[PDB]
Design an enzyme around this catalytic site. Structure first.
Site, PDB file in Angstrom:
ATOM      1  N   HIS C  43      -7.365  -0.653   8.895  1.00 22.43           N
ATOM      2  CA  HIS C  43      -7.030  -2.093   8.848  1.00 22.43           C
ATOM      3  C   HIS C  43      -5.945  -2.504   9.850  1.00 22.43           C
ATOM      4  CE1 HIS C  43      -3.717  -1.188   6.058  1.00 22.43           C
ATOM      5  NE2 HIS C  43      -3.132  -2.174   6.746  1.00 22.43           N
ATOM      6  N   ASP C  99      -9.855   3.766   4.470  1.00 26.96           N
ATOM      7  CA  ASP C  99      -8.949   3.046   5.360  1.00 26.96           C
ATOM      8  C   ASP C  99      -8.245   4.039   6.281  1.00 26.96           C
ATOM      9  OD1 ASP C  99      -7.521   1.058   6.598  1.00 26.96           O
ATOM     10  OD2 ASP C  99      -6.268   0.601   4.829  1.00 26.96           O
ATOM     11  N   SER C 198       2.088  -0.420   6.597  1.00 30.18           N
ATOM     12  CA  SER C 198       0.673  -0.039   6.580  1.00 30.18           C
ATOM     13  C   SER C 198       0.354   0.888   7.733  1.00 30.18           C
ATOM     14  CB  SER C 198      -0.197  -1.309   6.686  1.00 30.18           C
ATOM     15  OG  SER C 198      -0.636  -1.666   5.392  1.00 30.18           O
TER      16      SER C 198
HETATM   17  C1  LIG Z   1      -4.806  -5.630   3.524  1.00 29.90           C
HETATM   18  N1  LIG Z   1      -4.511  -5.058   4.833  1.00 29.90           N
HETATM   19  C2  LIG Z   1      -5.369  -5.640   5.868  1.00 29.90           C
HETATM   20  C3  LIG Z   1      -3.074  -5.123   5.171  1.00 29.90           C
HETATM   21  C4  LIG Z   1      -2.568  -6.561   5.376  1.00 29.90           C
HETATM   22  C5  LIG Z   1      -1.475  -6.807   4.358  1.00 29.90           C
HETATM   23  N2  LIG Z   1      -1.555  -5.656   3.458  1.00 29.90           N
HETATM   24  C6  LIG Z   1      -1.128  -5.676   2.136  1.00 29.90           C
HETATM   25  O1  LIG Z   1      -1.523  -4.875   1.265  1.00 29.90           O
HETATM   26  C7  LIG Z   1      -0.122  -6.791   1.739  1.00 29.90           C
HETATM   27  C8  LIG Z   1       1.328  -6.332   1.889  1.00 29.90           C
HETATM   28  N3  LIG Z   1       1.605  -5.139   1.109  1.00 29.90           N
HETATM   29  C9  LIG Z   1       1.423  -3.896   1.712  1.00 29.90           C
HETATM   30  O2  LIG Z   1       1.064  -3.782   2.894  1.00 29.90           O
HETATM   31  C10 LIG Z   1       1.678  -2.716   0.968  1.00 29.90           C
HETATM   32  C11 LIG Z   1       2.284  -2.614  -0.241  1.00 29.90           C
HETATM   33  C12 LIG Z   1       2.162  -1.285  -0.795  1.00 29.90           C
HETATM   34  C13 LIG Z   1       1.488  -0.473   0.055  1.00 29.90           C
HETATM   35 CL1  LIG Z   1       1.155   1.158  -0.205  1.00 29.90          CL
HETATM   36  S1  LIG Z   1       0.992  -1.265   1.474  1.00 29.90           S
HETATM   37  N4  LIG Z   1      -0.467  -7.178   0.406  1.00 29.90           N
HETATM   38  S2  LIG Z   1      -1.249  -8.612   0.124  1.00 29.90           S
HETATM   39  O3  LIG Z   1      -1.292  -8.735  -1.277  1.00 29.90           O
HETATM   40  O4  LIG Z   1      -0.477  -9.574   0.865  1.00 29.90           O
HETATM   41  C14 LIG Z   1      -2.766  -8.486   0.833  1.00 29.90           C
HETATM   42  C15 LIG Z   1      -3.081  -9.331   1.936  1.00 29.90           C
HETATM   43  C16 LIG Z   1      -4.335  -9.350   2.531  1.00 29.90           C
HETATM   44  C17 LIG Z   1      -5.353  -8.515   2.062  1.00 29.90           C
HETATM   45  C18 LIG Z   1      -5.117  -7.627   0.963  1.00 29.90           C
HETATM   46  N5  LIG Z   1      -6.214  -6.784   0.497  1.00 29.90           N
HETATM   47  C19 LIG Z   1      -6.008  -5.338   0.321  1.00 29.90           C
HETATM   48  C20 LIG Z   1      -6.898  -4.721  -0.724  1.00 29.90           C
HETATM   49  C21 LIG Z   1      -8.346  -5.053  -0.486  1.00 29.90           C
HETATM   50  C22 LIG Z   1      -8.600  -6.511  -0.252  1.00 29.90           C
HETATM   51  C23 LIG Z   1      -7.477  -7.360   0.237  1.00 29.90           C
HETATM   52  O5  LIG Z   1      -7.689  -8.553   0.419  1.00 29.90           O
HETATM   53  C24 LIG Z   1      -3.806  -7.635   0.377  1.00 29.90           C
HETATM   54  O6  LIG Z   1      -3.518  -6.830  -0.704  1.00 29.90           O
HETATM   55  C25 LIG Z   1      -3.901  -7.207  -1.956  1.00 29.90           C
HETATM   56  F1  LIG Z   1      -5.199  -7.340  -2.144  1.00 29.90           F
HETATM   57  F2  LIG Z   1      -3.749  -6.157  -2.739  1.00 29.90           F
HETATM   58  C26 LIG Z   1      -2.150  -4.509   4.121  1.00 29.90           C
END
Ligand SMILES: CN(C)[C@H]1CCN(C(=O)[C@H](CNC(=O)c2ccc(Cl)s2)NS(=O)(=O)c2cccc(N3CCCCC3=O)c2OC(F)F)C1
Ligand SMILES: *[C@@H]1O[C@H](CO)[C@@H](O)[C@H](O)[C@H]1NC(C)=O
Ligand code: NA
Ligand code: NA
Lengths: 27, 10, 250
Positions: C43, C99, C198
């Protein structure tokens, strides 16, 4: 063959501040 | 925000 | 990293920063697994919902770093990418299943006190260490809070959580290619990875051979450090057949 051994720690037999917390969890 | 890196890497 | 602390110098010499060329910014974490290969989250390179699809020329890899923003002259090494390899079954549409991605450097990086590869686990290392309650370590230059940025590399130690607890903390479908980690609301200890972490490594120090192994890749969380939520990590051993296939073929 030398993976996962840190020059400033394992290679000098010095421990970092929190690795003992990991070891204590490995029951 | 990030300090400029040498030109060679760009 | 939320509720972590400053890393000591050379504490995580396999830490890699994925850096965007223009505009100059931190994109993700990553890890050094050999002198020419870097491991990260798929990702970090491909996420169509956010219009993200990087090519080799868009990025740089910065190895041996401590300071987040400073150019660490004579310490860090900046490397160019030869090729990016994303797992062909990486599920960006649903749950980020598989991932994982590999990046091959144009030239080998010289090892130093600050630059050194981490081990990848074999089946016996994974069975021995990937147990609920066992702690691993996460490192990165990501956000200090869900809603600023650190001056230096941050570190946090977090316990692996039981599969049912991971599953019950989210509506997202959790697969065998993931594991979760962090403290329960009742444990009186906190911490998590966050935006910018990440792709970075979740490592454990084997008590059998005193080597550090990368068991996970920072993948996702519902926000950061929320009570009753956990951080989700790519299960590196489960994807080792793919890692080995890529390194063997190219
Ligand atoms: C998802 N990928 C592309 C990246 C972009 C932002 N990401 C997130 O998970 C964010 C911020 N938190 C983190 O990065 C982390 C927190 C703990 C760990 Cl381990 S990684 N959390 S979030 O809440 O803002 C979030 C923002 C965009 C997408 C997601 N996801 C990840 C899981 C599958 C589907 C989804 O939409 C997402 O997580 C949530 F679903 F759990 C990772
Ligand atoms: C990503 O970009 C490449 C071109 O660099 C293109 O061939 C590929 O189809 C793109 N993938 C997605 C999912 O947009
Ligand atoms: Na659930
Ligand atoms: Na939490």
């Amino acid at each position: 063959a030398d993976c996962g051994l840190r020059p400033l720690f394992e290679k000098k037999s010095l421990e970092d501040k929190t690795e003992r917390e990991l070891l204590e969890s490995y029951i | 925000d990030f300090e400029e890196i040498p030109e060679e890497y760009l | 990293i939320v509720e972590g602390s400053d890393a000591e110098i050379g504490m995580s010499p396999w830490q890699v920063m994925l850096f965007r060329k223009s505009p100059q910014e931190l994109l993700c974490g990553a890890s050094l697994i050999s002198d020419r290969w870097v491991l990260t989250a798929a990702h970090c390179l491909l996420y169509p919902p956010w219009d993200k699809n990087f090519t080799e020329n868009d990025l740089l890899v910065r190895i041996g770093k401590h300071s987040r923003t400073r150019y660490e002259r004579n310490i860090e090494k900046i490397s160019m990418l030869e090729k990016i390899y994303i797992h062909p079954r990486y599920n960006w549409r649903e749950n980020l299943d598989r991932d994982i991605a590999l990046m091959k450097l144009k030239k080998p990086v010289a090892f130093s006190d600050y630059i050194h590869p981490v081990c990848l686990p074999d089946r016996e290392t994974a069975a021995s260490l990937l147990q609920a309650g066992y702690k691993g370590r996460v490192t990165g230059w990501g956000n200090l809070k869900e809603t600023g940025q650190p001056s230096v590399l941050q570190v946090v130690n977090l316990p692996i959580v039981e599969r049912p607890v991971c599953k019950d903390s989210t509506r997202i479908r959790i697969t065998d290619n993931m594991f979760c980690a962090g403290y329960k609301p009742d444990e009186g200890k906190r911490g998590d990875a966050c935006e910018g972490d990440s792709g970075g490594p979740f490592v454990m120090k084997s008590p059998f051979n005193n080597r550090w192994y990368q068991m996970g890749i920072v993948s996702w969380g519902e926000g950061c450090d929320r009570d009753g939520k956990y951080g989700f990590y790519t299960h590196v051993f489960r994807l080792k057949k793919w890692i080995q296939k890529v390194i063997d073929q190219f």
